[PDB]
Amino acid sequence: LSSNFGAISSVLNDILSRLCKVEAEVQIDRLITGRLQSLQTYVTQQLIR
Amino acid sequence: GIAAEQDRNTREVFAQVKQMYKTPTLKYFGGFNFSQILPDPLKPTKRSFIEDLLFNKVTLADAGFMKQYGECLGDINARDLICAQKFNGLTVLPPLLTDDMIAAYTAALVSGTATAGWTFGAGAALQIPFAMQMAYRFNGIGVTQNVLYENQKQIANQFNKAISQIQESLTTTSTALGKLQDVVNQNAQALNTLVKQLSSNFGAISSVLNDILSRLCKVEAEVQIDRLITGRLQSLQTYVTQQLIRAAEIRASANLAATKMSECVLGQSKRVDFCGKGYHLMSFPQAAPHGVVFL
Amino acid sequence: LSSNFGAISSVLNDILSRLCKVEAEVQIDRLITGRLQSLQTYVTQQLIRAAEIRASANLAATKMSECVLGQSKRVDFCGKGYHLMSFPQAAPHGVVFL
Amino acid sequence: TQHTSSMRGVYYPDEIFRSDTLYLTQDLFLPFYSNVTGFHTINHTFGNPVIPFKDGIYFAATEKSNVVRGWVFGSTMNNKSQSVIIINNSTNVVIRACNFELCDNPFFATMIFDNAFNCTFEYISDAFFKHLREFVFKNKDGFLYVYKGYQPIDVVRDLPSGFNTLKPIFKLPLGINITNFRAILTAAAAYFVGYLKPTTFMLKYDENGTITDAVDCSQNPLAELKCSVKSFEIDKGIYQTSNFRVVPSGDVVRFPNITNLCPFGEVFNATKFPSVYAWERKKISNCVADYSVLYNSTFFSTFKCYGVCATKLNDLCFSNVYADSFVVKGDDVRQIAPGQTGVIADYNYKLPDDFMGCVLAWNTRNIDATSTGNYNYKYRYLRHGKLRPFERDISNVPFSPDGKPCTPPALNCYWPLNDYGFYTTTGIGYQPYRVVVLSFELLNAPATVCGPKLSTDLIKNQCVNFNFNGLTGTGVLTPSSKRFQPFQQFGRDVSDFTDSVRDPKTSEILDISPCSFGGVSVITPGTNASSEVAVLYQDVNCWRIYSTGNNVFQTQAGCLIGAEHVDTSYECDIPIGAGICASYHTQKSIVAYTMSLGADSSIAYSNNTIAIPTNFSISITTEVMPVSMAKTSVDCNMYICGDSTECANLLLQYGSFCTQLNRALS
Amino acid sequence: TQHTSSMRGVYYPDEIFRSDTLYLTQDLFL
Amino acid sequence: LPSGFNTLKPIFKLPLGINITNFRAILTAAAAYFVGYLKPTTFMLKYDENGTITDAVDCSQNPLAELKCSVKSFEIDKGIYQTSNFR
Amino acid sequence: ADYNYKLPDDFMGCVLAWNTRNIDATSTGNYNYKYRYLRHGKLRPFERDISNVPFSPDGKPCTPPALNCYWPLNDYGFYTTTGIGYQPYRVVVLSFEL
Amino acid sequence: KPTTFMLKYDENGTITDAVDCSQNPLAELKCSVKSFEIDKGIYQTSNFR
Amino acid sequence: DVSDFTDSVRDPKTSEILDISPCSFGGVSVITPGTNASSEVAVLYQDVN
Ligand SMILES: C=CC1=C(C)/C(=C/c2[nH]c(/C=C3N=C(/C=C4\NC(=O)C(C)=C4C=C)C(C)=C\3CCC(=O)O)c(CCC(=O)O)c2C)NC1=O
Ligand SMILES: CCCCC/C=C\C/C=C\CCCCCCCC(=O)O
Ligand SMILES: CCCCC/C=C\C/C=C\CCCCCCCC(=O)O
Ligand SMILES: *[C@@H]1O[C@H](CO)[C@@H](O)[C@H](O)[C@H]1NC(C)=O
Ligand SMILES: *[C@@H]1O[C@H](CO)[C@@H](O)[C@H](O)[C@H]1NC(C)=O
Ligand SMILES: *[C@@H]1O[C@H](CO)[C@@H](O)[C@H](O)[C@H]1NC(C)=O
Ligand SMILES: *[C@@H]1O[C@H](CO)[C@@H](O)[C@H](O)[C@H]1NC(C)=O
Ligand SMILES: *[C@@H]1O[C@H](CO)[C@@H](O)[C@H](O)[C@H]1NC(C)=O
Ligand SMILES: *[C@@H]1O[C@H](CO)[C@@H](O)[C@H](O)[C@H]1NC(C)=O
Ligand SMILES: *[C@@H]1O[C@H](CO)[C@@H](O)[C@H](O)[C@H]1NC(C)=O
Ligand SMILES: *[C@@H]1O[C@H](CO)[C@@H](O)[C@H](O)[C@H]1NC(C)=O
Ligand SMILES: *[C@@H]1O[C@H](CO)[C@@H](O)[C@H](O)[C@H]1NC(C)=O
Ligand SMILES: *[C@@H]1O[C@H](CO)[C@@H](O)[C@H](O)[C@H]1NC(C)=O
Ligand SMILES: *[C@@H]1O[C@H](CO)[C@@H](O)[C@H](O)[C@H]1NC(C)=O
Ligand SMILES: *[C@@H]1O[C@H](CO)[C@@H](O)[C@H](O)[C@H]1NC(C)=O
Ligand SMILES: *[C@@H]1O[C@H](CO)[C@@H](O)[C@H](O)[C@H]1NC(C)=O
Ligand SMILES: *[C@@H]1O[C@H](CO)[C@@H](O)[C@H](O)[C@H]1NC(C)=O
Ligand SMILES: *[C@@H]1O[C@H](CO)[C@@H](O)[C@H](O)[C@H]1NC(C)=O
Ligand SMILES: *[C@@H]1O[C@H](CO)[C@@H](O)[C@H](O)[C@H]1NC(C)=O
């Protein structure tokens, strides 16, 4: 959960405190897609086990 | 690969015998009533009375596998799920073996059991009257054959009564065939989830390519289209992975059904609780939607 | 490995020779995520194939135990007919029972 | 007359060496077995009309005595536009792009032009049926590309069949409108013309890096399958290809019927603009906004749009149009933008972060600036908080930093408005500028301010391209039974696909459907056996088929075309489905039949007879089973970032994913 | 005095026709 | 105030640009009026075949409504469901 | 950008411009520079239009001393004393491949 | 030199040990698994560079 | 290549053709006992004689 997935930071508070709304909305989606991918990988491994 | 395996499962379960025995005209073999598990030449259907109930218990989605274009443009007010799936590139292919073919296979198996016994799996069928076959089955579980030959009326009556109870149990609405309904429910839910997941914008301006191409400018539109492309590709990949795992589960079940048909319909088994609760005497197969029912 | 995954090019040398550092760092991450996704897909397919191979190997082990080391009463578990004997032979990635 | 281009006219797509690969590309190509037009010298008749140039041509000349000498490319072809002449005058190859008076009968033995002026491009080369000379001409981004190829032939009448790859020789920077062309002959020969289309090809390279074979992916379903699997060889079986598609035929444009030109003069040319603290808003409605009437008189120093590319502003229609007007100084024009700070953006006029519209500003030193000094424009510089977007503050109340009311002749009490002092002799950062901000919405609501695009008649029950108020697409339009409310214009699915529209001229509701529908399977034997295939279409009753061929008949699986139905039943090797199977049997052909379940047998039940075996046989049966597969390992660092330090540094924070992959493989 | 708003005061969130769907939205509601 | 469900339609979108913090009603010189306050909330709305809103689910009312908004359905089968964690 | 000189969307190159008020502007007024303001369509990228033909909105040929018939080229009027938005600038566009 | 290190922190927030990831293949393995302890066995490390 | 890797070049001074190859090649495995026993390891290199 500490990967930034090619964004400014891995902390949503840092992005929302400093960046500006349209620019922050394109950095939040990278973290959203990365964390969704992590959950999907966990679920697939669990199904095989 | 998944679809080819689905054809192979049915072939490995139902097509074990090589020659198709005809249904005998007489259904009454020494006290035992085989009329409810064999086809009769008077009804329009090609299948037995119990298989009719089994196909009535399970509701299907695709009646046929043919939805014409004029039919989907004739049904727009009724938001049909199949038209929505087909307009987005998702299709369902017919099985190779028709239900009539599977019914013919099960009829051949039941006729061979009732006339030849256990010998048509090892090789050529050997005829034997049904009372003697019952005597050998009784002798196989450690009971002498005079017990059969002196109580034949009672055993025949109990067999007929048990068949009637099986018939009465399947006419009342219940969840006996509930793990065959789960398969079709899971398939329908997966396809509908693919259809509904197509409205996510995946962090873009819109989820509609027409809106992006009508308003945005070419280099800026080419970076918004790739987000939708990657999102929809990810959705298809997730669907394919779930389908592969479900196919593995179905293949394990079909392997168990094939070995159970081999060791319990074509012979008598010594394995405890492998075919019913008690000392195994016989088994009969019946076809069901996407599956098999052993009695 | 020749997909650009929505970037300028699929070659890192072309991006680093021409684009500028902050702009190159947002084009390299697309290639990184795409290639990581490709490796993950390969690993998932390999795990599923390994499960199928393991089921086959378990069946081969129990067949060697119950048909080469003894005589089986199970119908059609080892050949068509009444089982008398079995002999194993090695094969590339597998076993052949006679 | 009419001939066919049998695998004719392939060229090198780029300047990159490739060997022993299959390359898939999409470009302007001559499609396989397409129509070509022949021009022959039957008699003294000089056959050379003006042939139209439709985004590139393939030209072939079959020659024995060098009759065709060059070409003229142009648009008007008289004296009014630029034209380019490419000829060989038996000593040089000369290319000349000028503005010259053409002749009705241009020929050699040099009569091509009466006179020439305003010459733009010049190129002179170096000094210097049996022949076939092939050319590809294409125009793109002000460049004329020429590709050339040569072949010795012996044919006397027709264009010979074969395959030959053309190489680039010229890339001329002309910048010329090319719509028409004409060949130049000498005073016994033939030439052939074909047209290029946007197409996907798959090309094969040798070990010498030469193109020797290609596959046109849109010729027939077998070629679609070949391009899908990226191989020239297909094994025996049945393959699910792409679904059945039709191409759009017509165009439909439906816009609201508006007559009035939209009031540019009343907005941009007004005698009086307000101050920035008291900015004014005006609604714009029922007008045609083409803005090309401003190219004669009015010019803007800044013009910036947000939410839409400017080049599409003539193809759209706008829903809720408002215009804000005010006056600032030159140094404050940069503050009229989203996400900005300063006195104007904080206390006078603020734009939203998700703003959609345009900002226009122009210098007005000759109207709002006097030599004495214009002091009629004001701005607020003191406030107790920032403004919200599109919020106005009008009050003139004395300001105190602590926050309590005060009397202006006192201490720590100020007047919150300052004057702009506009002089003629000041620098440009202190000169007045007039600013207009336009705000609107796009493609989600009823609209009444549109562009100058012309409308078109409606077409029903046919795959067309459509444009409703700027929303474009491809589909089939049918009358609908939905009941829109007066504030609604569009309708959407559960998957956010626009499926209903209200026609803006006659207020009827229309349903939109996709054009492609229905699964298609291709049944083939091995590629070694034949190039013939059979096609099975689900969802059609035997229409919506690619070709009718021979032997079309209905099965339980679908409509089968290209196979013959036989009454006898066998085992099957190609499973079609629903009990139907196919095979390749005898002249060989593809046959379809019902599969056989097994052998017929009869044993009779008796209550007193038994059957006993008398003899036996010993049998040995083989059974093969897999046990293991190949053990494999990957290295993320080399696969993702091969010998690059910067990529490895960027990858350094993805290490958990790679250790997870390595654990799975081990 | 004090009363309760029992499923009171729902409005149309946009100007787009929808039929036979369930739509999830986030806005200022009672 | 009677109970029930009734959907409201847009009639006005006025471009005022005014700081609005207070309001007051105007009466004639026997009647009642009721005031409630809006909150930022997630709803789930149901449409008819005529395109009319006839039912809704407020996703923050109780855990059953949270479950309904999570599964996107108005009907829940018998069983036990893991909802969102306690906030 | 519509009638005189258009750049491609995927342009690669550089644009340079500088003020030239001391060379191309006179006190009397330099009227030797022209631009087109009337056309029946937009230009394609890197396309040139040279013709000087009378323009009619309906689209038919006409004689310039008539009604609804214009000359399609306007003069730039470059003076020394004007503001900087009306001063001449020299522009060079470089295009290449990499 | 430009180098990748792995540092260990105490419960007092003090650095008391480190691993230089480019010293020898054992240190490469330690930095790959992110641990100071390796169990007995054979491990596929990075390819030869 | 087939993977879009630049593998050949023409030298711009003398018009000869040159092949470009990567520098890293060959798998490496590390055999270790437990970290408690020793810090000594054995290294197995495939693809070298
Ligand atoms: C029309 C423009 C035109 C172009 C672009 C052109 C290009 C061209 N002409 C060539 C040779 C040649 N080209 C021709 C003749 C012709 N080839 C033609 O396309 C035509 C129309 C003629 C008729 C005059 C001949 C006779 C040779 C020399 C063949 C030889 O060397 O044996 C070559 C090969 C050069 C080489 O030998 O290495 C090229 C690339 N020739 C042209 O005439
Ligand atoms: C005055 C009412 C205008 C209403 C138009 C509403 C929407 C149309 C959107 C943009 C129109 C731009 C007009 C100015 C273009 C200037 C072009 C230029 O020279 O750079
Ligand atoms: C002189 C010491 C300044 C130190 C301030 C340090 C950090 C604060 C960051 C930015 C302050 C910007 C000050 C100028 C703002 C001008 C606003 C305008 O009119 O456009
Ligand atoms: C049992 O057999 C008799 C024939 O004697 C038949 O009439 C009867 O229908 C059979 N039972 C059932 C339930 O069909
Ligand atoms: C090509 O010419 C044939 C006549 O031989 C004609 O039938 C066909 O329609 C033409 N092709 C196209 C695309 O029009
Ligand atoms: C010049 O090209 C334009 C499109 O760029 C076209 O509309 C016009 O008709 C062409 N000129 C002639 C004379 O055909
Ligand atoms: C262009 O050609 C035409 C041909 O009729 C001629 O009348 C006209 O004068 C020519 N223009 C020039 C500038 O020479
Ligand atoms: C061909 O054209 C060139 C171009 O000017 C000229 O120099 C040459 O003399 C011409 N050849 C003949 C035979 O006229
Ligand atoms: C084209 O030629 C005419 C004379 O016929 C001339 O007046 C005009 O300036 C020329 N155009 C260009 C762009 O040189
Ligand atoms: C490749 O080039 C060599 C050398 O000219 C030639 O001998 C060989 O035939 C070529 N390959 C093919 C497939 O033609
Ligand atoms: C452009 O302006 C000039 C000068 O006022 C005028 O003569 C000309 O007719 C105008 N053009 C149009 C098309 O109105
Ligand atoms: C603006 O209006 C004034 C008076 O109405 C007029 O003199 C002036 O020419 C107009 N300017 C433009 C650019 O139309
Ligand atoms: C113009 O629009 C009105 C409003 O929809 C419509 O009634 C009328 O038919 C339209 N005019 C024509 C000529 O169709
Ligand atoms: C196809 O059409 C014929 C007559 O048009 C009809 O008899 C037949 O049932 C149809 N096939 C199907 C599968 O509906
Ligand atoms: C049948 O048995 C006899 C003796 O038991 C033997 O000679 C004969 O070979 C057997 N039949 C066959 C076909 O082998
Ligand atoms: C939809 O509209 C029709 C026509 O007014 C009406 O009869 C029907 O009752 C409506 N549907 C519902 C669910 O009220
Ligand atoms: C952490 O700090 C405490 C207090 O100084 C000390 O007693 C303890 O030893 C420290 N921990 C270590 C590992 O040195
Ligand atoms: C300069 O380049 C030419 C062309 O390749 C080459 O022949 C020559 O050797 C070069 N000069 C030197 C000093 O190498
Ligand atoms: C290693 O090299 C030796 C001699 O250099 C040779 O005999 C041996 O076969 C080689 N090993 C392998 C695996 O090739």
Numbering used by the authors:
A (entry chain B): 948 to 996
B (entry chain A): 751 to 1045
C (entry chain C): 948 to 1045
D (entry chain C): 31 to 139, 150 to 168, 179 to 237, 249 to 603, 619 to 662, 671 to 750
E (entry chain A): 31 to 60
F (entry chain A): 209 to 237, 249 to 306
G (entry chain B): 406 to 503
H (entry chain B): 258 to 306
What do the paper's sentences say?
We introduced these three disulfide bonds in equivalent positions in the SARS-CoV-1 S sequence generating three spike variants: S/x1 (S370C and D967C), S/x2 (G400C and V969C), and S/x3 (D414C and V969C). We determined cryo-EM structures of SARS-CoV-1 S/x1, S/x2, and S/x3 spikes and we identified various previously undetected conformations for SARS-CoV-1 S through classification procedures.
In SARS-CoV-1 S/x1 locked-1 protomers, a linoleic acid can be modelled in the density identified in a lipid-binding pocket within the RBD. In the S/x1 locked-1 protomer, cryo-EM density for residues between 602 and 619 is not visible suggesting that these residues form a flexible loop. We have proposed that these interactions rigidify this area preventing structural transitions needed for RBD opening. We identified clear densities consistent with biliverdin molecules in S/x1 locked-1, locked-2, locked-112, and locked-122 structures in a NTD pocket equivalent to the previously identified biliverdin-binding pocket in SARS-CoV-2 S.
